[PDB]
């Protein structure tokens, strides 16, 4: 069901190396609905190539637009299993400190802060 379940560590590592080769300015991001989630839709896809200069605050706006949310729906975005310390950090900086050992940056969203 989840991305890590669908692809071998080898396949995830090689895909990241290829994004490096072909999409060198992009951060490879996996974005997944919380398995417990009732309110928010699932995304049309899992793997997002994010320009490396956008900050976390803009990536939240992008995903809320991708989900076609309205002003008073709640949306929480976990990175590498935990709350974002700050929405102002550029995603290039977030990648270097929060990337998985496979080379992807793993995110999960819910309507609840208590996932
Ligand atoms: C904000 O992230 C989304 C942008 C679209 N995307 C791309 O693949 N980018 C376009 C270009 C061919 C690589 C990943 C999802
Ligand atoms: Cl690029």
UniProtKB/Swiss-Prot annotation:
Effect ascribed to mutating residue 48 to A: Decreases C18 ceramide binding
Gene Ontology terms: cellular component: autophagosome; autophagosome membrane; axoneme; cytoplasmic vesicle; cytosol; endomembrane system; microtubule; mitochondrial membrane
Keyword Mitochondrion: yes
Tissues in which the UniProt entry reports expression: Most abundant in heart, brain, skeletal muscle and testis. Little expression observed in liver.
S-S bonds: none
Subunit structure, interactors included: 3 different light chains, LC1 (a cleavage product of MAP1B), LC2 (a cleavage product of MAP1A) and LC3 (produced by one of the MAP1LC3 genes), can associate with the MAP1A or MAP1B heavy chains. Interacts at microtubules with CABP1 (via EF-hands 1 and 2) but not with calmodulin. Interacts with FYCO1 (via C-terminus). Interacts with TP53INP1 and TP53INP2. Interacts with TBC1D25. Directly interacts with SQSTM1; this interaction leads to MAP1LC3B recruitment to inclusion bodies containing polyubiquitinated protein aggregates and to inclusion body degradation by autophagy.
Pfam family, one: ATG8
Gene from which this protein is expressed: MAP1LC3B
Listed name of the protein: Microtubule-associated protein 1 light chain 3 beta
